[PDB]
Ligand binder design. Structure first.
Ligand SMILES: COc1cc2c(cc1OCCCN1CCOCC1)Cc1c(-c3ccc(C#N)cc3)n[nH]c1-2
Length: 252
């Protein structure tokens, strides 16, 4: 069929990311216009999951990826408010399904945040941007990480304190910060350091302060298990799936 290979760039989505529409079929795709690029394409070619942004191919580098019409999770969070608890729980279930998948194939995202969490037409959460992602398990052998990656309010404390650390508890921590943002509409600290008063207040269990005062006791008990400073004592995803609020039936 002629012209099915022609795509029209209609608007900027956020190098740059552009919404491209097929001339013939009117199918929409997101086009990412860019050592690190080669790894991103290689990691993207491994991915196939319902809660991970689809990769269609590559061809200046033009990465062709899934268009998510619901936009960013970031824009569903009302500043200092958050969102209804049942929406946050459903998005958190979908985030865990995505993270379990990635960890299962030995990939760590390393920059989980609401800007990188996209929503399709049915508001299904999709993990996006594997530009900072790396392989932490190969030939069933785990590789400890040492590189500084991520966004300070979402990074786990071990990344700032230790020379080497396990990949999986780092992504679990960033997921607990995303959960905090969804339920309170605010980030708890600039970074997880003892010099940070908000971080020190949390370790001292001062949950009568913001953002914790806005969060119900059942999701707050989950956050007490995720935002644990020692990554060896931090709750794992199999145990998050057993948490009481995680399995609480909720409706608006
Ligand atoms: C439907 O709207 C959007 C769709 C998408 C994005 C942003 C979108 O929203 C633009 C932000 C507009 N906001 C309005 C209110 O507040 C200011 C910003 C970004 C994006 C992507 C995407 C796919 C893959 C990657 C990678 N790597 C990066 C981005 N796929 N689909 C979309």
């Amino acid at each position: 069929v002629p012209f099915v290979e022609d795509w029209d760039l209609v608007q900027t989505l956020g190098g740059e990311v552009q919404l491209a529409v097929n001339r013939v079929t009117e199918e929409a795709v997101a086009v990412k216009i860019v050592e690190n690029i080669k790894k991103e394409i290689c990691i993207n070619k491994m991915l196939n999951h319902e809660n991970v942004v689809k990769f269609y191919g590559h061809r200046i580098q033009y990465l062709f990826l899934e268009y998510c019409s619901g936009g960013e999770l970031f824009d569903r969070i009302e500043p200092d408010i958050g969102m209804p608890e049942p929406d946050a729980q459903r998005f958190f279930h979908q985030l865990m399904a995505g993270v379990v998948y990635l960890h299962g194939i030995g990939i760590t995202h390393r920059d989980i945040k609401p800007e990188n969490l996209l929503l399709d037409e049915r508001d299904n959460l999709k993990i996006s941007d594997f530009g900072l992602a790396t392989v932490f398990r190969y030939n069933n052998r785990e590789r400890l990480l040492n590189k500084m990656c991520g966004t300070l309010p979402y990074v786990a404390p071990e990344l700032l304190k230790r020379r080497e650390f396990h990949a999986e508890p780092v992504d679990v921590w960033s997921c607990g910060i995303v959960l905090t943002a969804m339920l309170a509409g605010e980030l708890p600290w600039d970074q997880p350091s003892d010099s940070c008063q908000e971080y020190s207040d949390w370790k001292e269990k001062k949950t009568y302060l913001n953002p914790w005062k806005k969060i119900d006791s059942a999701p707050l008990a989950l956050l007490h298990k995720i935002l644990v400073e020692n990554p060896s004592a931090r709750i794992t995803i199999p145990d998050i799936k057993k948490d009481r609020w995680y399995n609480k039936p909720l409706k608006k």
